[PDB]
Design a protein around this ligand. Structure first.
Ligand SMILES: C[C@]12CC[C@@H]3c4ccc(O)cc4CC[C@H]3[C@@H]1CC[C@@H]2OC(=O)CCC(=O)O
Ligand SMILES: C[C@]12CC[C@@H]3c4ccc(O)cc4CC[C@H]3[C@@H]1CC[C@@H]2OC(=O)CCC(=O)O
Lengths: 133, 131
């Protein structure tokens, strides 16, 4: 198992586990999370969430007042043990029965130490589905 | 209006299928890097990708020579930036002599402000290829 694979798989288990300290242990001090890439609700300036404090906030905000599934549909290794891509499905269910889902490509890059420097999501609000119950 | 990233991605598969080398290079920024795949492999010998129009020209030549290359987009994943996009692509080679070669990967593309490809990056390796 490559470092990029251990890291990305560990990052889904830690959100499954709602395990904030284990999630942050996976991150480099210079981590940038672009979920999604570009200006969006979860990326207000289009530039990403930078550094472990900010990314901790991101974790805290995301796991609050909703059930947050991340399923790996498919994995695409590259030829670098430090970079990898996956198709993931994300489901949040907030209060009253709401309900957002998105399916995206996510790419991950780790440093020489095995820690996440980048996580990048290809999705936008037009691809997201809303529901009730 | 399709995004600059999507126009560029779709044009690059059209240029390849038309064996249009000048069309293909007109899509590229002068600082273009192509990592097909990311990391060391037959098509990325030093692992840092193919850099610049001249080198990316040579890449085009080597991939289409004696080859019936089809590039089929199975699925497209826009981002929230009109300059970055990802696709699942099936790259199918049928060389002269009849020998088949195939890979299905994730490819990401980035364009600059002019709409020219700065990056093209493939998530595949030789262990994923079929024959
Ligand atoms: C955009 C969201 C789903 C839609 C929600 C939403 C939907 C409609 C609305 O009027 C307000 C809000 C506020 C919170 C909004 C959510 C914040 C994160 C969530 O979407 C993400 O979990 C998708 C994947 C990810 O960013 O990890
Ligand atoms: C199939 C190739 C690796 C993938 C290249 C390739 C990769 C992507 C693409 O869009 C087109 C092509 C056409 C040329 C393709 C190469 C021709 C020979 C090369 O494969 C060999 O290095 C290994 C062959 C074998 O494992 O038997």
């Amino acid at each position: 198992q490559s470092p990029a694979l251990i890291a990305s798989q560990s990052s889904w288990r830690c959100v499954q586990a709602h395990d904030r300290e284990g999630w942050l242990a996976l991150m480099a001090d210079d981590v940038v999370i672009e979920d999604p890439i570009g200006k969006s609700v979860t990326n207000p300036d289009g530039s990403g969430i930078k550094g472990k404090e900010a990314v901790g906030a991101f974790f805290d905000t995301h796991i609050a007042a909703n059930r947050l599934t991340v399923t790996c549909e498919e994995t695409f290794p590259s030829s670098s043990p430090d970079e990898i891509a996956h198709i993931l499905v994300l489901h949040s269910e907030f209060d009253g029965g709401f309900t957002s889902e998105v399916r995206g490509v996510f790419t991950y890059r780790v440093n020489k130490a095995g820690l996440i420097t980048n996580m990048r999501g290809y999705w936008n609000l037009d691809m997201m589905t809303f529901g009730n119950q």
